[PDB]
Amino acid sequence: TRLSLEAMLAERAMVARQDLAGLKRKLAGADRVLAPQSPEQCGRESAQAQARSVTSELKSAVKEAQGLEHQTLDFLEQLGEYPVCGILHGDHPVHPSGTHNNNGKVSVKRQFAAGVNTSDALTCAFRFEDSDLVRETALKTTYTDGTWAGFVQRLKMQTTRKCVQEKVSRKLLKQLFPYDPQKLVDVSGELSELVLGIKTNAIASAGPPYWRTKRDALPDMLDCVLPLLYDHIVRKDLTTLRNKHPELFLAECKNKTDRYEVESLGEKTRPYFSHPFHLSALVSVLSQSFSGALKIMTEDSTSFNAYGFSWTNGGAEDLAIWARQAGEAGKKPPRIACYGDDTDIYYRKDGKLYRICPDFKQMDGSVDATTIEAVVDYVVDAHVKQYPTARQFWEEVGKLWVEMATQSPFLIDGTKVYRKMQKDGLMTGVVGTTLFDTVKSALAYNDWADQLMFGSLNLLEEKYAIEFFKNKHGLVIKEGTWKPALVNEDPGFGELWTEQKFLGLQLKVVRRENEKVYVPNLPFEDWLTMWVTPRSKYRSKETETMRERTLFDRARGLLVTGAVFDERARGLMGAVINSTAPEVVCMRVQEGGGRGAPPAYAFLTRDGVFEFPISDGYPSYDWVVSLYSRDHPCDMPRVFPEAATLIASYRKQVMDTRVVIK
Amino acid sequence: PTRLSLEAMLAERAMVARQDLAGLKRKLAGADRVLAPQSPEQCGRESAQAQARSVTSELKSAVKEAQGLEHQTLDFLEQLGEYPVCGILHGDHPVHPSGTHNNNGKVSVKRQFAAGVNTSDALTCAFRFEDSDLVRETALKTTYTDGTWAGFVQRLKMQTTRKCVQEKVSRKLLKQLFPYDPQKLVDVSGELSELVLGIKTNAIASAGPPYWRTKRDALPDMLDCVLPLLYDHIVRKDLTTLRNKHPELFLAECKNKTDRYEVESLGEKTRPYFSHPFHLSALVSVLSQSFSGALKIMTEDSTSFNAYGFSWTNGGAEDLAIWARQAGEAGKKPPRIACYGDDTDIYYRKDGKLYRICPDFKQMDGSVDATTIEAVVDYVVDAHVKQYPTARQFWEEVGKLWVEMATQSPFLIDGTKVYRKMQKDGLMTGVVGTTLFDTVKSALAYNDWADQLMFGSLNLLEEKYAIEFFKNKHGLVIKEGTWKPALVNEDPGFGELWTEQKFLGLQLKVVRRENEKVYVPNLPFEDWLTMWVTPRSKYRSKETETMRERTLFDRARGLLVTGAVFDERARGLMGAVINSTAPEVVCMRVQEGGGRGAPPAYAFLTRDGVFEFPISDGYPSYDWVVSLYSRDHPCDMPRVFPEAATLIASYRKQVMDTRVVIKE
Ligand SMILES: Nc1ncnc2c1ncn2[C@@H]1O[C@H](COP(=O)(O)OP(=O)(O)OP(=O)(O)O)[C@@H](O)[C@H]1O
Numbered sequence A: 001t002r003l004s005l006e007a008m009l010a011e012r013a014m015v016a017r018q019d020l021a022g023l024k025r026k027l028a029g030a031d032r033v034l035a036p037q038s039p040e041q042c043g044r045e046s047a048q049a050q051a052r053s054v055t056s057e058l059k060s061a062v063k064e065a066q067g068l069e070h071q072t073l074d075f076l077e078q079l080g081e082y083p084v085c086g087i088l089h090g091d092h093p094v095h096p097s098g099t100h101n102n103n104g105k106v107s108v109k110r111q112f113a114a115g116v117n118t119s120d121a122l123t124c125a126f127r128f129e130d131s132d133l134v135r136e137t138a139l140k141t142t143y144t145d146g147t148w149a150g151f152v153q154r155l156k157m158q159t160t161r162k163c164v165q166e167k168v169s170r171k172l173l174k175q176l177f178p179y180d181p182q183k184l185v186d187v188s189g190e191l192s193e194l195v196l197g198i199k200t201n202a203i204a205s206a207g208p209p210y211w212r213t214k215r216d217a218l219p220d221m222l223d224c225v226l227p228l229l230y231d232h233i234v235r236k237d238l239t240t241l242r243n244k245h246p247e248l249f250l251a252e253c254k255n256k257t258d259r260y261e262v263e264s265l266g267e268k269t270r271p272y273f274s275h276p277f278h279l280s281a282l283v284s285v286l287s288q289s290f291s292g293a294l295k296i297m298t299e300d301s302t303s304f305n306a307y308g309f310s311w312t313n314g315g316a317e318d319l320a321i322w323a324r325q326a327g328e329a330g331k332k333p334p335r336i337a338c339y340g341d342d343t344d345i346y347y348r349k350d351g352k353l354y355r356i357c358p359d360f361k362q363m364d365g366s367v368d369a370t371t372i373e374a375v376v377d378y379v380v381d382a383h384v385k386q387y388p389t390a391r392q393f394w395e396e397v398g399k400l401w402v403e404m405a406t407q408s409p410f411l412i413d414g415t416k417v418y419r420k421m422q423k424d425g426l427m428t429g430v431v432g433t434t435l436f437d438t439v440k441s442a443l444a445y446n447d448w449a450d451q452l453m454f455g456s457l458n459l460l461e462e463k464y465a466i467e468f469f470k471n472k473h474g475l476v477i478k479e480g481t482w483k484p485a486l487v488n489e490d491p492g493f494g495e496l497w498t499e500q501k502f503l504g505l506q507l508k509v510v511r512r513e514n515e516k517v518y519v520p521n522l523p524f525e526d527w528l529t530m531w532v533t534p535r536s537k538y539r540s541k542e543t544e545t546m547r548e549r550t551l552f553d554r555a556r557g558l559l560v561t562g563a564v565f566d567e568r569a570r571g572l573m574g575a576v577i578n579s580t581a582p583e584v585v586c587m588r589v590q591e592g593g594g595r596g597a598p599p600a601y602a603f604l605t606r607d608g609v610f611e612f613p614i615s616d617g618y619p620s621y622d623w624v625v626s627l628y629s630r631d632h633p634c635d636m637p638r639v640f641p642e643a644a645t646l647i648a649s650y651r652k653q654v655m656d657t658r659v660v661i662k
Numbered sequence B: 001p002t003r004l005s006l007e008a009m010l011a012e013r014a015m016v017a018r019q020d021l022a023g024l025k026r027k028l029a030g031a032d033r034v035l036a037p038q039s040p041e042q043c044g045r046e047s048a049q050a051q052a053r054s055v056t057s058e059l060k061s062a063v064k065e066a067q068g069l070e071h072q073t074l075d076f077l078e079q080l081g082e083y084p085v086c087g088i089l090h091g092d093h094p095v096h097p098s099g100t101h102n103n104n105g106k107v108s109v110k111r112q113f114a115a116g117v118n119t120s121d122a123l124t125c126a127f128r129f130e131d132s133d134l135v136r137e138t139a140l141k142t143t144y145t146d147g148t149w150a151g152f153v154q155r156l157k158m159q160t161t162r163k164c165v166q167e168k169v170s171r172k173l174l175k176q177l178f179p180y181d182p183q184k185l186v187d188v189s190g191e192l193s194e195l196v197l198g199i200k201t202n203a204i205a206s207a208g209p210p211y212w213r214t215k216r217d218a219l220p221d222m223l224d225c226v227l228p229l230l231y232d233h234i235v236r237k238d239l240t241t242l243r244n245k246h247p248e249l250f251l252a253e254c255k256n257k258t259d260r261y262e263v264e265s266l267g268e269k270t271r272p273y274f275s276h277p278f279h280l281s282a283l284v285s286v287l288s289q290s291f292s293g294a295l296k297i298m299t300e301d302s303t304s305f306n307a308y309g310f311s312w313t314n315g316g317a318e319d320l321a322i323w324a325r326q327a328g329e330a331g332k333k334p335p336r337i338a339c340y341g342d343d344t345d346i347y348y349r350k351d352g353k354l355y356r357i358c359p360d361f362k363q364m365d366g367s368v369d370a371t372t373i374e375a376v377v378d379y380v381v382d383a384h385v386k387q388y389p390t391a392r393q394f395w396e397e398v399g400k401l402w403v404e405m406a407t408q409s410p411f412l413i414d415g416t417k418v419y420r421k422m423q424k425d426g427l428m429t430g431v432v433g434t435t436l437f438d439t440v441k442s443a444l445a446y447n448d449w450a451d452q453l454m455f456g457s458l459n460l461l462e463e464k465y466a467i468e469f470f471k472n473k474h475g476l477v478i479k480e481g482t483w484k485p486a487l488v489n490e491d492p493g494f495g496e497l498w499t500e501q502k503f504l505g506l507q508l509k510v511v512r513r514e515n516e517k518v519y520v521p522n523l524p525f526e527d528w529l530t531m532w533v534t535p536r537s538k539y540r541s542k543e544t545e546t547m548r549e550r551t552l553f554d555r556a557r558g559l560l561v562t563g564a565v566f567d568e569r570a571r572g573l574m575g576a577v578i579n580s581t582a583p584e585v586v587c588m589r590v591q592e593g594g595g596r597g598a599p600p601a602y603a604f605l606t607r608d609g610v611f612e613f614p615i616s617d618g619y620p621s622y623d624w625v626v627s628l629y630s631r632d633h634p635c636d637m638p639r640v641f642p643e644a645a646t647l648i649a650s651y652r653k654q655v656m657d658t659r660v661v662i663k664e
């Protein structure tokens, strides 16, 4: 209890940042740097209220659409009813005694709740922008559980599909998807440590049989089910397990609470699968290690791979350089990119550079079996060529990988266990749902590019490419995508690469001193829609303190994502930031890691993990640019410049001890 | 925080599950537990409750009766009229809170005497394990209370108005009796603002006037506000304006020390001490802590009379012995004298036999003279401004203030009236140096005493004669029946005591390892009981059910390291508490330095000043406590629950190798 006086200062400092009622006292009367701000349109009451008109309509529209009838589930093979597990971990069974199972058989509910998605997020928009424009973009999209009609229909999409088995040589994958053999991990190591080193979400579902969050399910998975899964892989005794504890191989096909468009949610509600934690984990050893060793577009000029691309630190400009080296169609190779279903294609006609950023309709249901089997092989094989001692174990793991991605039993609603009738079609949500879409896409655009050399330049048109992709590759292209755009390869300041978007973002050049910096950008509607529609349903218990903070965090993220480069966008968020109280800026917050909340857009860094220098700092224009530029990220300008001085409430007044005294 | 490694997720679970006692109960429920030697319990709930509730009442009702008495008026203190309030502001608030004292116009302060005793839970266990009618009595002789008003005044009067004797104290004499390592003094010349920061003090203690709040609440309002105002006015040597404009800056608070008083003398004994202003108390402590850490003790220099720095742990208990066992024959060659303030350890030989004197002084603070205090300050000040005079005249001014604080700082007691000590003899207890000021006056007096023996004055070895020499030549009282030289077992056997005498509140004992004897502290069970039964903490209103059973553990775990394990009877009572404490409350996330459980009450284990355990769920075994007081390594602290590490995270690593072949 006896401290040094410099410690007691550090004591109060790290403590005072948590006393809000005291934080205002100190901070309320202090200088503050104000971001560029769109001026206030209506009063408080007018704004909060209009956000409840838009909200109520959206709900009553979703509610009305949640009353439609879902289609039958004949298109799925039925395995009958899987019984309850089954295995205990000392005190408790791994499948909690009370949690959902219809006494004897496993079962689950079906979230389709409408539909309140905050309301302050839109409120801030009404206050600082035109109520007529705010309202329309706020009726454009909505984030909800979806509808039963749109769920089954979109499920029947990626189930009934007719896929084309991509003829793929293992050397072709070495061509299209190069990798540094060293950045893979020694998979010959003992299994325990290798699974622990796996990065996965902590709050997501652990799947069967746990039916609890992956953290509250980790010790049961790790110490109980993992060895019991291991010891059955070693002697191919998985079929014994699959009958005594069949839940260990069960999945859950769920509707993704996601930001959907309003007039298309009686049709479109995307389904995803959740495999068991032990299955999801063990497989993730390979998919994560390989994805880390994967080279991308910029590094290797022979790669069609984008899975691992980021914008910041020249990355946004690396896309440009890699794009312009594309060749005149029919004579020299083009430059195609593949991050899952999203693709960036660059070809040249009559010298000029053209860009297409097309989309595939429900592309997950299009991935053929032999593609999946090859990828799984290619990954497993690439591992056991450098770390060869475990040559047959990871094979058995790889064989399991394919089952999960193709023929894995899953629950949808009630006790009934369903399964895809055909080996084709990818079960979205399966460990590796990013490379499978990538590979199928790349192989499709590889053959397409190969077709161009044969003088068949007709495939540069939409009408023809649609047929070619459909009949020869089973892949299907959105009508109205294949729209070649003249690219300004060397744009000027404020000028754009193209109008199109890769990874949901336009490219843009902005000014740095004399230099120009290639940065991501969006039209105001796209920035505004994202703001109004937040990927989090209202917590209710959440405090008036925390959402005022969450808005500040989200407002910061979008500016980093490129909202700063669009004036109408930058102004709104800058207002939101400047709207935010002093205490909810310098409060010690609890997100990775006290440095505020990171931007949701996961392509800013390799890691997906982008993290701010500080909690009490806003992204200024010249800072955000400093990110995407090659060189240093600049000073992150503190909202309250000398805040450290007033929380400690100590202004170092230096006093020497050498003074001559009167 | 969303995506992270499973390696880090277990880290989350582990660090978190330790905060869920509902789970630690479920996990730590039926686990493997290491047990301590335990006293066969003799009672329990209800059967031991009233046993303590009755004692708790009869204590209070005797304290309340003792708190209800007259208090001889304060005529012995000069009265200074009344001091106005500050005054000085600091942004949105003063340095003197709007609500707290005064009452009106100018400063006051309320001296409270609760009734108002310690908790009973700690006593309940003593009734739950130990001899009832013994604990019924030993709990009644001592208690931790605010004290009584007569006991407060009488002893205040006793130390403010005692005829002291100024000491012959040449500064070169102080170099002998108090040698210091000149290099290890803090470079007092480097800047004041940063120099003050490196000062250690109790963060929960009162900061004194004009703050009237804890040192944590008053730290900022001192350093960027008051201290410059103090510095400014010092360097101009116009401190004499800061007097009359803001007099509460030099005002102290004379409060009664709440500690362990014996119930008989409650009506005539309650220790007073002066809470000094934080800025004053801080600035001075620059020279104290620098010199306290640069001082030398028994075990180092042989000439030194100083103990202020001695610690038992790591050979210290034996380092005391070897220093003692070269005290010569009385009258022919120098003895061995040991001064830690008002606690002294004298060794001398009489016809070859080694003898030990452990006497005490009666209110020794009030016996400390002016010239001693004046020459100690001068000694500590000049020791700094010679290695680093590059700051000579500033700290000399600081020195004169140090003198003022320890001598005639005006102070409040009760109500509004500011008093002040009539004479300039008598030390103001609670000042920064009370531990060195006492030490010097002790050493200065015993030096003369030792010098007298070399005149054939061996008569002073007897108590009847030693009493007068200290009262008529140093004004230093010695309690009646303490000066009793006991023959010393110079080489104690295993379990055999050095002497039965008491230095620094502890006996010196010798215990066993394998093959070597280890010198350790010790106390009889009656003393370990009193220390247990009387916690220096009153109930603390709102503190939960659970937080106490961790406290009883952390206390019991503390006495054992102090030396409660080396006594057989005491080792049983503590183990009984450790064994009875809950599984969860052993391994749970505890909040004391630095998560490694609570420290022990004793301050002289390692000094330094900070002794803390390796772990939070550790049990202080016999074989581990000895490992401290021996010169060897500290053993790994035995876990009460060895497998709790894995039992908490519910993961025991199963080796599953991937190189194995796949067959059938
Ligand atoms: N547990 C302990 N922790 C710290 N110091 C201790 C402990 N036990 C003894 N001491 C030291 O030993 C000394 C014991 O002297 P003690 O206070 O008993 O004299 P006293 O008779 O109470 O004098 P007074 O007349 O002032 O009441 C203390 O001053 C203290 O410095």
Ligand SMILES: [Mg+2]
Pocket (backbone or CB within 6 Å): A022, A649
């Ligand atoms: Mg404050």
